[PDB]
Design a protein around this ligand. Structure first.
Ligand SMILES: COc1ccccc1C1CCN(c2nc(C3(F)CC3)nc3ccc(N(C)CCO)cc23)CC1
Ligand SMILES: Nc1nc2c(ncn2[C@@H]2O[C@H](COP(=O)(O)OP(=O)(O)O)[C@@H](O)[C@H]2O)c(=O)[nH]1
Ligand code: ALF
Ligand SMILES: [Mg+2]
Lengths: 658, 317, 6, 297
């Protein structure tokens, strides 16, 4: 290969491998948390939608981390409870009874027997007796301590949670949540490496997120090409499907973290399966063997089960769409042609010739998730033979392959064991009502098939089995960027994107909370937290020494307060950032911090409405008498809450004054 | 090789006394230096009893009969056992006058309202002999000395043909948490309960009856899943205290469920034994009980003669 | 004889 | 008083053949390179600079500097403009090579920094400043002289000889400054940046130990060294002849030295143009991805 390609590959590989032992060091940009005063607005914003309950926070990764570290360091009473809960959770992940026996005895002695002897145990007799009855019989199921989990959560829900909310670590949670809700991604935020694939409406590049360093796969769709091929509906459907299946914990599907668009591209951020697709590895390694294909079939069956449980039908199932991760475990990747059959069963012949179900290939006849099982059979057949059960592209014409609707699968006796012959005979049935997986419970009908009789599906979900193939660690595991190529830019000439077209993607951008929180927790949570803490320590010392504290008790009846930019003065600085206080009768206004002063009285307000200025969202207040004020906030949540609270305040004040 | 045993029970129950008795019978008798050391122990025990009963008199505001002894009483308040030494002449007369004082005698008869060592009466009867400079305490005096144990203390020992190592542990609530580490390979458990604890509340808590705590601890120990293969023996100690406490106190007030006839020491003992054996969760388990009194060597001899046989039969290897 | 070309 | 050159006809033919053989390559291949093509902007800019250096400059020499020395065709303003174009092209080529070196170094060593410091608009600004703007700023004082009739023929066209008219001190000072700006500065930056990049690539090779990647990086470092080697071997003779025109302690030249200096002028300018012809060859050799498109176009 030429020098440029070699350099691109080396840069991509080094960025992928850099600082594996210290993920925090991979970030080139830094997350700047807002000031601790943010909680005055963010608390109301979260309360107004009921998000400050114990379950909501404790179920969030960052919320859980902050609550845990508060209990373990700033509340002695809650320390044993959180320690017990955490060790129970650790125990639940033990995979063998030989280890669970000792772990459970240690947990019992440490957190139950000691307290019982000292008579300090606060838990109910029921949980004690349940655990004692299970253990006296030598039973160590993973659900041993579930009653203790419930009771620990009940105890933490009490004054412990209120103390946490009143603490300075709920302020940190508010800061992190505000940083989350203000995610506005652009192509600048990512360091895009060499192209790794192409197809559909655009290309796929490996990329590193700037402010966390986590490696992602950026899938870009060109808006002009989408308009040219009338693909707006498909482009939006792909986002719907990705957001539908990403919300969860399934490790068998390429999950989406973010979605955004530039003026000309639609971009999805997905998991990076640096091992490459299974078709490339099949070509390099050759036909797999039955014990090897057991692994792939089991993993793909679990993935399809996850998708089907959500009523999504994966119409294009090929070896090319199956991506191997670093360690060799597979995932389903391309949800471009996926559809939902819960509302109405599709009827379009969408797929790839040689892997489409007979009812999919038939015109007009509706079909359900039943299609994915025929495609699974065809795919498993390819892994063992190098081609679909019906002729390949180089062996027959496209419509000659379509004669799959007028024949029956060969079902070779040589390369297949009788169990596999039965499995493929079931999966390649012409009649949907008789086809395996298309009757009864669905995924269970296949999972219980004889070919998987030896397989323990719990270990499949846990991914304990050794992959048959481990992708090379020193290669990109993809075709050369010259081979992948690029779309012809001339094809888009004559295509113009109207404002009515950019309106189709008004609501496109998206961020998934759990995925972002997990990324932050893995990468830069502790570093940022420490830096932030140092910054507030510095500023607190400065304020204490020089006076002008952060706030003088926040007044007597302040509804809310926070920074806002008094905007729009041509003869002064446009961004006159200041600190504001809201009261039921007036809105006060403070300078650098010496003394607050009144800016406005609610009785004067005529209306409050949002407006766009300098391509930035702002708040417009119109005043009885022709006066007006413009205020600009920093995070959409600040703007939303300020709008809501100002509106409610003046409406109530004027209605009462009526 | 040697089997591990535990002696469990609430504080003050009498485990260390049983350890002393076992050492005396199947071990090495205490030497002259031992008794010389124990003389000081007896001295601070007497001082502690005197101070405790004076403090009880003050809190209960019981008037004194002897005005002069009041001065001594003040002196008693001034005595501190941290910088302790042998008993002195000015203190023996004051102690004798106080003990002979009917008011403090009535206060002690009302001892149920405050903590007090059960050996107080024995030492008071001893009087001059114990307080005499030529102090040569007998085995009884050494046995009847109270020294709060704390922490796990393994006491190696052996029978005539087998080796059975004992473990003495503290009985105070704060200290019980330390037992986690002594349960590793228990072969049989000996449990001690004070038969006279039905009247006195705990030391750590002034509202919970001692017997209730003992029953709760017995239930907790039996509930242990990993003791299913270890025998349990319930030594009902301090029967000589109960035979008088019942005569002076009605068991109905403490536990009304004991609707048996009053003043029947055997009836009360049987009721307590039944109440304790009932706490077991599963009847298939067997609980062996023996009325005893650690302060009497013969009772301990008789009880151990059968305890060793039961333990040996339980474990054939 | 000094040259001229540059 | 030598009115006409004493150069041999054999040289007059051989050097002319060399000039035309270099002209054909540095025109065809250089224009093809410009057509084929954020470094690509720099590669095309240097291609344009070399193409100008050849096309604009070389043909004027023939029959006025190479094939003859006595007559001069263009007027005083014509000669001044010709030297202006020559020096502007030379400075542009050298500074553009330096800019390519620094751009590539920033792109390879710190790509994230390059994403900002080497923005498309920023790259356009830098290339515009360097090419057609930076050259025109340094040349005016360096090439705005000529038309000093010294040959005894006088009125005869062969008598009118073009030569820098500045005084010996001023002319020597300006040539020294020209060499400083066009040779030492871009040579220094090119050498240091290329050495850093070669060190990085050698480290990668040592850690790399795939055969394709090993070959690619080995050829890359070899070409990175060959770039400076070609720069020195092709420019140092030119600047040395230009300086020794002026950096002479006496006005006395022996006739043998005169003829040797004229032959030296011929070969040195030939090498100077060879430098402009080299770029497409290394562009093709160093990149197969570029080689295939170059051959296709
Ligand atoms: C300092 O570079 C100079 C100076 C003077 C003359 C020519 C060069 C070239 C050296 C080789 N070259 C490239 N060098 C490198 C290095 F910096 C050594 C890594 N990576 C490349 C990558 C691509 C490429 N193309 C011709 C693009 C064709 O698609 C050229 C280079 C371009 C400048
Ligand atoms: N009269 C009488 N006193 C006893 C008996 N058992 C123990 N004691 C006394 O109770 C006091 C406290 O017992 P102790 O040795 O601390 O038992 P432990 O708390 O289990 O270590 C000791 O001073 C003993 O003299 C008994 O059976 N009868
Ligand atoms: F109550 Al103790 F030693 F006196 F455990
Ligand atoms: Mg003791």
């Amino acid at each position: 290969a030429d020098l440029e390609a070699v350099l691109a590959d080396v840069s991509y590989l080094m960025a992928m491998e850099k600082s594996k032992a210290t993920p925090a060091a991979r970030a080139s940009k830094k997350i700047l948390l807002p000031e601790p005063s943010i909680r005055s607005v963010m608390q109301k914003y979260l309360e107004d939608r009921g998000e400050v309950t114990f379950e909501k926070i404790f179920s969030q990764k960052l919320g859980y981390l902050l609550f845990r570290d508060f209990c373990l360091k700033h509340l002695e009473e809650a320390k044993p409870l959180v320690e017990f809960y955490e060790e129970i959770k650790k125990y639940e992940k033990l995979e063998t009874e030989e280890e669970r026996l000792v772990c459970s005895r240690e947990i019992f002695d440490t957190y139950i027997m000691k307290e019982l002897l000292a008579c300090s145990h606060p838990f109910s007799k029921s949980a004690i007796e349940h655990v004692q009855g299970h253990l006296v019989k030598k039973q160590v199921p993973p659900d041993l301590f579930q009653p203790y989990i419930e009771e620990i959560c009940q105890n933490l829900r009490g004054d412990v949670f209120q103390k946490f909310i009143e603490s300075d670590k709920f302020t940190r949670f508010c800061q992190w949540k505000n940083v989350e809700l203000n995610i506005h991604l652009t192509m600048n935020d990512f360091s895009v490496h060499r192209i790794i694939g192409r197809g559909g409406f655009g290309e796929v590049y490996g990329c590193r997120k700037a402010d966390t360093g986590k490696m992602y796969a950026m899938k870009c769709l060109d808006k002009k090409r989408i308009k040219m091929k009338q693909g707006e509906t498909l482009a939006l459907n792909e986002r719907i499907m990705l957001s539908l299946v990403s919300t969860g914990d399934c490790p068998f599907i390429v999950c989406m973290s973010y979605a955004f668009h530039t003026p000309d591209k639609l971009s999805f951020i997905l998991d990076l399966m640096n091992g490459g697709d299974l078709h490339y590895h099949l070509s390099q390694h050759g036909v797999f063997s039955e014990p090897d294909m057991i692994f792939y079939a089991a993993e793909i069956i679990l993935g399809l089960e996850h998708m089907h449980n959500r009523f999504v039908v994966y119409r294009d199932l090929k070896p090319a769409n199956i991506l191997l991760d670093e360690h060799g475990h597979v995932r389903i990747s391309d949800l471009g042609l996926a559809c939902d059959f819960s509302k109405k069963k599709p009827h379009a012949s969408v797929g790839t010739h040689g892997y489409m179900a007979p009812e999919v290939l038939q015109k007009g006849v509706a079909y359900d998730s039943s299609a994915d099982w025929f495609s699974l059979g065809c795919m498993l057949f390819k892994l063992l033979r190098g081609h679909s059960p019906f002729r390949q592209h180089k062996t027959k014409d496209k419509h000659e392959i379509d004669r799959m609707t007028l024949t029956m699968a060969v079902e070779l006796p040589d390369s297949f064991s009788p169990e596999l012959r039965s499995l493929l005979e079931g999966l390649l049935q012409r009649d949907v009502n008789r086809r395996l997986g298309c009757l009864g419970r669905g995924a269970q009908e296949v999972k219980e098939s004889p070919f998987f009789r030896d397989l323990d599906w719990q270990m499949v979900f846990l991914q304990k089995y050794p992959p048959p193939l481990i992708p090379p660690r020193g290669e990109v595991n993809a075709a050369d960027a010259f081979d992948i190529g690029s779309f012809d830019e001339e094809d888009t000439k004559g295509i113009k994107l109207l404002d009515s077209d950019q309106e189709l993607y008004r609501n496109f951008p998206l961020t998934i909370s759990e995925r972002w929180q997990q990324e932050v927790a893995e990468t830069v949570f502790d570093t940022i937290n420490a830096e932030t803490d140092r910054l507030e320590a510095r500023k607190k010392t400065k304020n204490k020494q020089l006076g002008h504290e952060e706030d003088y008790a926040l007044g007597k009846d302040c509804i809310m307060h926070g920074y806002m930019s008094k905007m729009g003065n041509p003869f002064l600085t446009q961004w006159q950032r200041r600190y504001f206080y809201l009261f039921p009768n007036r809105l006060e206004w403070r300078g650098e911090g010496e003394a607050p002063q009144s800016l406005l009285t609610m009785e004067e307000i005529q209306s409050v409405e949002e407006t766009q200025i300098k391509e930035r969202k702002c708040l417009l207040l119109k005043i009885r008498g022709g006066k007006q004020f413009v205020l600009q906030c920093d995070s959409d949540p600040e703007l939303v809450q300020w709008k809501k609270e100002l509106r409610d305040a003046y409406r109530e004040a004027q209605q009462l004054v009526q | 090789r040697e089997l591990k045993l535990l002696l469990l029970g609430t504080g003050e129950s009498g485990k260390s006394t049983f350890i002393k008795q076992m050492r005396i019978i199947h071990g090495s008798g205490y030497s002259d230096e031992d008794k010389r050391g124990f003389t000081k122990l007896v001295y601070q025990n007497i001082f502690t009893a005197m101070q405790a009963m004076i403090r009880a008199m003050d809190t209960l505001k019981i008037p004194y009969k002897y005005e002069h002894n009041k001065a001594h009483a003040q002196l008693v308040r001034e005595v501190d056992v941290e910088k302790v030494s042998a008993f002195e002449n000015p203190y023996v007369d004051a102690i004798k006058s106080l003990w002979n004082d009917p008011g403090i005698q009535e206060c002690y008869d009302r001892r149920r309202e405050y903590q007090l060592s059960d050996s107080t009466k024995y030492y008071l009867n001893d009087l001059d002999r114990v307080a005499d400079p030529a102090y040569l305490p007998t085995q009884q005096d050494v046995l009847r000395v109270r020294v709060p144990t704390t922490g796990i203390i393994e006491y190696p020992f052996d029978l005539q043909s087998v080796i059975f190592r004992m473990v003495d542990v503290g009985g105070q609530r704060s200290e019980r948490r330390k037992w986690i580490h002594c349960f590793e390979n228990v072969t049989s458990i000996m449990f001690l309960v004070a038969l006279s604890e039905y009247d006195q509340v705990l030391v750590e808590s002034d509202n919970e009856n001692r017997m209730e705590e003992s029953k709760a601890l017995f239930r907790t120990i039996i509930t242990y899943p990993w003791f299913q293969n270890s025998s349990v023996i319930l030594f009902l100690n301090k029967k000589d205290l109960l035979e008088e406490k019942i005569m002076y106190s009605h068991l109905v007030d403490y536990f009304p469920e004991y609707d048996g006839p009053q003043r029947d020491a055997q009836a009360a003992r049987e009721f307590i034994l039944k109440m304790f054996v009932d706490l077991n969760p599963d009847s298939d388990k067997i609980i062996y009980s023996h009325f005893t009194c650690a302060t009497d060597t013969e009772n301990i001899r008789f009880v151990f003669a059968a305890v060793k046989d039961t333990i040996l039969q339980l474990n054939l290897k | 004889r000094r040259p001229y070309i540059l | 008083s030598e009115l006409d050159v004493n150069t041999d006809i054999y040289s007059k033919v051989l050097v002319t053949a060399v000039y035309l053989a270099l002209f054909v390559v540095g025109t065809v291949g250089n224009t093809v390179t410009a057509f084929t093509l954020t470094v690509h902007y720099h590669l095309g800019s240097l291609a344009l600079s070399d193409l100008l250096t050849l096309l604009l400059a070389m043909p004027v020499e023939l029959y006025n500097f190479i094939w003859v020395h006595h007559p001069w065709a263009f007027g005083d303003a014509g000669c001044r403009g010709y030297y202006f174009l020559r020096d502007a092209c030379t400075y542009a080529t050298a500074l553009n090579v330096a800019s390519l070196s620094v751009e590539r170094y920033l792109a390879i060593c710190h790509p994230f920094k390059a994403k900002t410091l080497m923005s498309r608009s920023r790259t356009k600004k830098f290339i515009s400043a360097i090419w057609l703007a930076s050259a025109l700023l340094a040349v005016p004082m360096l090439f705005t002289m000529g038309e000093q009739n010294r040959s005894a023929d006088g009125q005869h066209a062969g008598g009118l000889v073009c030569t820098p008219t500045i005084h010996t001190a001023t002319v020597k000072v300006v040539i020294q400054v020209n060499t400083f700006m066009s040779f030492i500065f871009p040579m220094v930056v090119i050498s240091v940046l290329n050495t850093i990049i070669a060190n990085k690539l050698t480290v990668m090779v040592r850690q790399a130990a795939e055969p394709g990647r090993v070959q690619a990086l080995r050829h890359g470092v070899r070409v990175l060294r060959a770039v400076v080697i070609a720069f020195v071997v092709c420019w140092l003779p030119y600047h040395v002849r230009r300086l020794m025109f002026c950096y002479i302690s006496d006005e006395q030249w022996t006739p043998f030295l005169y003829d040797f200096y004229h032959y030296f002028y011929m070969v040195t300018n030939a090498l100077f143009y060879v430098s402009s012809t080299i770029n497409p060859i290394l562009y093709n050799l160093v990149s197969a991805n570029f080689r295939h498109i170059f051959l296709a176009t």
